[PDB]
Design a protein around this ligand. Sequence first.
Ligand SMILES: [Zn+2]
Ligand SMILES: [Zn+2]
Ligand SMILES: [Zn+2]
Ligand SMILES: [Zn+2]
Lengths: 78, 84
Amino acid sequence: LLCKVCGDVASGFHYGVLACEGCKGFFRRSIQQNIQYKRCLKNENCSIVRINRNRCQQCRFKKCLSVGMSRDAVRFGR
Amino acid sequence: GMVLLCKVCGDVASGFHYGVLACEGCKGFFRRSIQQNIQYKRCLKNENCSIVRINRNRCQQCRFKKCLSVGMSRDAVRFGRIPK
DNA sequence: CAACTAGGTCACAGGTCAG
DNA sequence: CTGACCTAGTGACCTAGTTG
Ligand SMILES: [Zn+2]
Ligand SMILES: [Zn+2]
Ligand SMILES: [Zn+2]
Ligand SMILES: [Zn+2]
């Protein structure tokens, strides 16, 4: 499976999407606090892949919130 | 390893930056180099300089060319704990 | 109870600012 | 400019916990 967010290999089904450890952790970290990720530099249309997933935080998150990641979409068990 | 040396200048490496084991100077140098319209003067020797700790700041152009020469890329960064 | 994941833990690019 | 010291994260791993 492929992280449905940065094409990096997926560790499991996370927050309602197949994802890699980095985007899972990066997701919980984004919702599990009231952080104000700095505005976007490159006009809010940032690509997100395994090689540049950490460059824009607003865009990696916004992307997370588009492939349908969410806790109300969490799914425990086989 | 206990002590790995900077692949750009042989200084002690403070980690694995931009894709390779670099000292802390090249690290901040590479970053500063790619992070701007920073174009260094040419190299009075047609870029054949060598890099070591003592002369690593003499010819910039050649150091940067050394960084890129070894692999330093924003696309080669390995964040978080070293795997196994 | 096993298959399977949300969270915590903690091993690991960039801003500073003195030299 | 340069780079030793901070700050703010990043994600490999472990396992407490949840389903079916
Ligand atoms: Zn990912
Ligand atoms: Zn962006
Ligand atoms: Zn170095
Ligand atoms: Zn030179």
